[PDB]
């Protein structure tokens, strides 16, 4: 199984340089039957190929002319990774950056393995970690044999916040809403889940809030209330 | 001639479960069979659906099919399923730079579904900070049109709430809405009744979910 | 009633085949204003792409019939722009000149070690070129009939005078 893991700061100050990394598992960056690309996506412009690096007998590079002056995609043979560097970033560079393996056969040429993505925001503002508050289940959040509960993730910057329930073991009935923008410039979202009311006394429900641009990992247990 | 430009049609389309849907992609220059189709589900990376115009990627269901060569291509879903709610992209690999289409948003029509309304008082932990957030939840409704009104002590609120709706659900094609009334701790404790009135097409009459600050 | 058919090959007129046709007394053939045979059938031992053209007979004149020869890509050469001497850090474009019928569907590029490179079009842009990229390169064309190889054309990358 081939997998790609991305890492790098999601908040870059203007005129400074973006730097991301894509770690490869189940394959080697020196593969002569593949190429390792970087593709960015934004609601402004959609999916745009940025560049790639590959090895045959030497190391080569193909770059989009949009970023030819600022892009740099270097492989790492010792750690089995390849990097993306973009000098002199602007707020226009705010987008989600994907790494992907390009199977480069004679007739098949596609991006078959993609990384998870890394949202990068270009802004002068400082990073702010979120504050997680429980949305405890109650009689006013219960109808029939179904109870609703969740977590409130308030006042963070920049996007995004990822939320999982019970470290991934609880997925059915989960709704994580898109972030709202407050007058403050900070973001906020809520993640809810509907569970049977009969098992509120025996099951444990923990929300796992993740905010990578601030190194924030918070797990809050949502306890029921009579009220 | 320059960079090969891909244009998809339609830009968006609505369809019900089981319907036949087709997405067309045209290249400005000929690319032979160096075309790929991707599916991007909400919050996920693009997923390779079809490579070399007509060959199905491993694991992709058989309802997806591709056709064409040269400049005109077609992606077909013979019987649409609720899991297929996504944006679909075509991409050419014949010439550098490789370019994608603008995408096709696929939305799922389905029957009317009334929302389940829940309300959450502010947590005691947030009240220590100095502000109070009252959250009202609209769960699994269709269609998208839903009006949320906040009423504190029967007085309609204005300018202190924020809404946010989800994308269509992967299983039942429904929407969920989260409305957050944000007040200061001082403004919160000076009132008692906090209500959330919801009017939707699936409801015979507006539904109000309320609570008392004391209880 | 005067006309010409292609008896002897089913169809698929390829350069290796022994091609023919006959006219349907005193026979005469003609291509490009010159008579090529006084027999009923005008036949070739091994057809070459330049034998293709518009033929005619008369015993009264036939109507023009165009012989079309399909062949694998031939006479392939790797052109280089601005040239085979490119400074490091700039662009070197390799064009795979070809001649085929039908034209080349897809190309294949190799290096000196016969490693395939991830390009499929007729032109390949190396940018930015490095001095390590100096070496021999060659392309390959493909169509309905067969394949075609080009000789080893080398590209040299020199440093900048600073
Ligand atoms: C590369 O392939 C060509 C044609 O198949 C052959 O003539 C040549 O010797 C090969 N070179 C190497 C290094 O294998």
Tokens matching residue A105? 């056969």
Q: How does strand A146-156 pair with strand A131-135?
A: antiparallel
CB atoms A62 and B162 under 8 Å: no
Residue C96: closest CA among C138, C125, C127, C147: C138
Tokens matching residue C149? 């190889």
Give the contacts of A176 (CB within 8 A, at least 6 positions apart).
A163, A189, A190, A191, B166
Backbone discontinuities in chain C, residue before each (C to N > 2.5 A): 24, 59
Give the contacts of B161 (CB within 8 A, at least 6 positions apart).
B148, B150, B179, B180, B181, B182
Q: How far is the CA of A176 from the centre of ligand 1 (A)?
A: 58
Neighboring chain C residues of B97 at a CB cutoff of 8 Å: none
Protein residues whose CB sits closer than 6 Å to any atom of ligand 1: C 113-114
User: From CA C162, how far away is CA C144, in angstroms rounded?
Assistant: 50
Q: What residue ranges define each of the domains in chain B, with the CATH number in brackets?
A: 6-109 (2.60.40.10), 116-212 (2.60.40.10)
Start and end residues for every CATH 2.60.40.10 domain found in chain C: 3-67, 71-158
Q: How far is the CA of C114 from the centre of ligand 1 (A)?
A: 6
- Residues A88-117 as b or e (16 or more Cβ within 10 Å = b): ebeeebbbbbbbbbbbbeeebbbbbbbbeb
User: From CA A39, how far away is CA A50, in angstroms rounded?
Assistant: 5
User: From CA B90, how far away is CA B24, in angstroms rounded?
Assistant: 9
User: From CA B42, how far away is CA B170, in angstroms rounded?
Assistant: 9
Q: How far is the CA of B91 from the centre of ligand 1 (A)?
A: 33
Q: Is A144 helix (H, G, I), strand (E, B) or coil?
A: coil
Give the contacts of B145 (CB within 8 A, at least 6 positions apart).
B200, B201
This PDB structure is determined at a resolution in Å of 2.4
Topology of domain A3-122 in CATH is: Immunoglobulin-like (2.60.40)
Give the contacts of C35 (CB within 8 A, at least 6 positions apart).
C28, C29
Alpha helices, DSSP H, located in C50-100: none
Give the number of the atom of ligand 1 that is nearest the alpha carbon of residue C113: 13
Q: Whose CA is nearest to atom 1 of ligand 1?
A: C114
Distance separating the N- and C-terminal Cα atoms of chain B: 72
**How far apart are the CA of B78 and the nearest CA of chain A, in angstroms?**
23
Give the CB-side neighbour count of residue B155, counting CA atoms within 13 A: 6
Give the number of the atom of ligand 1 that is nearest the alpha carbon of residue C112: 13
For chain A, give every domain's residue range. Answer: 3-122, 131-221
Cis? peptide before C82, omega within 30° of 0: yes
- Chain A residue with minimal CA distance to B133? A152
**How far apart are the CA of A57 and the nearest CA of chain C, in angstroms?**
7
Angle CA(A77)–CA(A82)–CA(A86) in degrees, nearest 5?
140
Q: Is A198 helix (H, G, I), strand (E, B) or coil?
A: helix
- The three-state DSSP-derived secondary structure of chain B is CCCCCEEEECCEEEEECCCCEEEEEEECCCCCCCEEEEEECCCCCCEEEEECCCEECCCCCCCEEEEEECCEEEEEECCCCHHHCCEEEEEECCCCCCEECCCEEEEEECCCECCEEEEECCCHHHHHHCEEEEEEEEEEEECCCEEEEEEECCEECCCCEEEEECCCCCCCCCEEEEEEEEEEHHHHHCCCEEEEEEEECCCCCCEEEEEECCC
**How far apart are the CA of B50 and the nearest CA of chain A, in angstroms?**
9
Q: Whose CA is nearest to atom 8 of ligand 1?
A: C114
- Chain C residue with minimal CA distance to A62? C127
Angle CA(B67)–CA(A109)–CA(A80) in degrees, nearest 5?
150
Interface contact A130, partner B, CB < 8 A: no
User: From CA B104, how far away is CA A76, in angstroms rounded?
Assistant: 36
Residue B176: closest CA among B189, B164, B187: B164
User: From CA B37, how far away is CA B17, in angstroms rounded?
Assistant: 21
Burial of B137: CB neighbours in 10 Å, binned 0-12, 13-18, 19+: buried
Q: Is C31 helix (H, G, I), strand (E, B) or coil?
A: strand
Q: Is A202 helix (H, G, I), strand (E, B) or coil?
A: coil
Q: Given this chain, do its domains A3-122 and A131-221 carry the same CATH topology? A: yes
Maximum separation of any 2 CA atoms in chain C, in Å: 82
Cis? peptide before A185, omega within 30° of 0: no
C-alpha distances out from residue B187 to B122, C29, C67, Å: 13, 106, 93
CATH architecture of C71-158: Sandwich (2.60)
Neighboring chain B residues of C120 at a CB cutoff of 8 Å: 34, 93-95
Topology of domain C3-67 in CATH is: Immunoglobulin-like (2.60.40)
Long-range pairs for A102-106: beta carbons < 8 A, 24 or more residues apart: A102/A34, A102/A35, A102/A36, A102/A37, A102/A52, A102/B93, A102/C118, A103/A33, A103/A34, A104/A33, A104/A34, A104/A35, A104/A54, A104/C116, A104/C118, A105/A33, A106/C106, A106/C108, A106/C116
Topology of domain A131-221 in CATH is: Immunoglobulin-like (2.60.40)
Experiment type: X-ray
Tokens matching residue B202? 């699936």
Alpha helices, DSSP H, located in chain A: none
């Amino acid at each position: 199984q081939v997998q790609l893991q991305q890492s790098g700061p999601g908040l870059v100050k203007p005129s400074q340089t973006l730097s991301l990394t894509c770690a490869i598992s189940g394959d080697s960056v020196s593969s002569n039957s593949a190429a390792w690309n970087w593709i960015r996506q934004s609601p402004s412009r959609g999916l745009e190929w940025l560049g790639r690096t590959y090895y045959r007998s030497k190391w080569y590079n193909d770059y989009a002319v949009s970023v030819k002056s600022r892009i740099t995609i270097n492989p790492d043979t010792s750690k089995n990774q390849f990097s993306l560097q973009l000098n002199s970033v602007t707020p226009e560079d705010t987008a989600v950056y994907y790494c992907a393996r390009e199977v480069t056969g004679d007739l098949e040429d596609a991006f078959d393995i993609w990384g998870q993505g890394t949202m990068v925001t270009v802004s002068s503002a400082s990073t702010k970690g979120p504050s997680v508050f429980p949305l405890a289940p109650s009689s006013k959040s219960t109808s029939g044999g179904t109870a609703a509960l969740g977590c409130l993730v308030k006042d963070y910057f920049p996007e995004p916040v990822t939320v999982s329930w019970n470290s991934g073991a609880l997925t059915s009935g989960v709704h994580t809403f898109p972030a709202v923008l407050q007058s403050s410039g900070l973001y906020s979202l809520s993640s809810v889940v509907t569970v049977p009311s009969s098992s509120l006394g025996t099951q444990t429900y923990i929300c796992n809030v993740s905010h990578k641009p601030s190194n924030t990992k918070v797990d809050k247990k949502v306890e029921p209330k009579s009220c | 001639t320059g960079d090969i430009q891909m244009t998809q049609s339609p830009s968006s389309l609505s369809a019900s479960v089981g319907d036949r849907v087709t997405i067309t992609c045209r290249a400005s220059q000929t690319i032979w069979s160096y075309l790929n189709w991707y599916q991007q589900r909400p919050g996920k990376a693009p997923n390779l659906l079809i490579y070399a115009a007509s060959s199905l990627q491993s694991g992709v269901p058989s309802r997806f099919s591709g056709r064409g060569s040269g400049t005109d291509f077609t992606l077909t879903i013979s019987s649409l399923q609720a899991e297929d709610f996504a944006t679909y992209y075509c991409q050419q690999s014949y010439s550098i730079p490789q370019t994608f289409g603008q995408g096709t948003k696929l939305e799922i029509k389905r029957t009317v579904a009334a929302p389940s309304v829940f309300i959450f008082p502010p947590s005691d932990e947030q009240l220590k900070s100095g502000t109070a957030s009252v959250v009202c939840l609209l769960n699994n409704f269709y269609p998208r049109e839903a009006k949320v009104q906040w009423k504190v002590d029967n007085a309609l609120q204005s300018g202190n709430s924020q809404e946010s709706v989800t994308e269509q659900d992967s299983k039942d094609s429904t929407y969920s809405l989260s409305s957050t009334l944000t007040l200061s701790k001082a403004d919160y404790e000076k009132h008692k009744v906090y209500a959330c009135e919801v009017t939707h097409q699936g409801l015979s009459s507006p539904v109000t979910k309320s609570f008392n600050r004391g209880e | 009633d005067v006309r010409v058919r292609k008896i002897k090959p089913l169809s698929e007129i390829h350069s290796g085949n022994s091609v023919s046709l006959q006219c349907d007394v005193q026979f005469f053939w003609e291509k490009n204003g010159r008579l090529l045979g006084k027999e009923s059938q005008l036949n070739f031992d091994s057809i070459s792409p330049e034998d293709a053209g518009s033929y005619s007979c008369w015993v009264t004149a036939s109507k023009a019939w165009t012989l079309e020869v399909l062949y694998a890509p031939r006479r392939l050469r790797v052109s280089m722009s601005p040239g085979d001497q490119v400074m490091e850090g700039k662009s070197a474009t390799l064009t795979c000149e070809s001649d085929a019928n039908p034209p080349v569907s897809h190309y294949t590029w190799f290096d000196w070690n016969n490693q395939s490179l991830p390009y499929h079009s007729q032109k390949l842009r190396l940018e930015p070129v490095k001095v390590q990229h100096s070496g021999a390169y060659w392309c390959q064309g493909t169509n309905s009939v067969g394949k075609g190889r080009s000789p080893l054309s080398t590209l040299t990358v020199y440093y900048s005078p600073e």
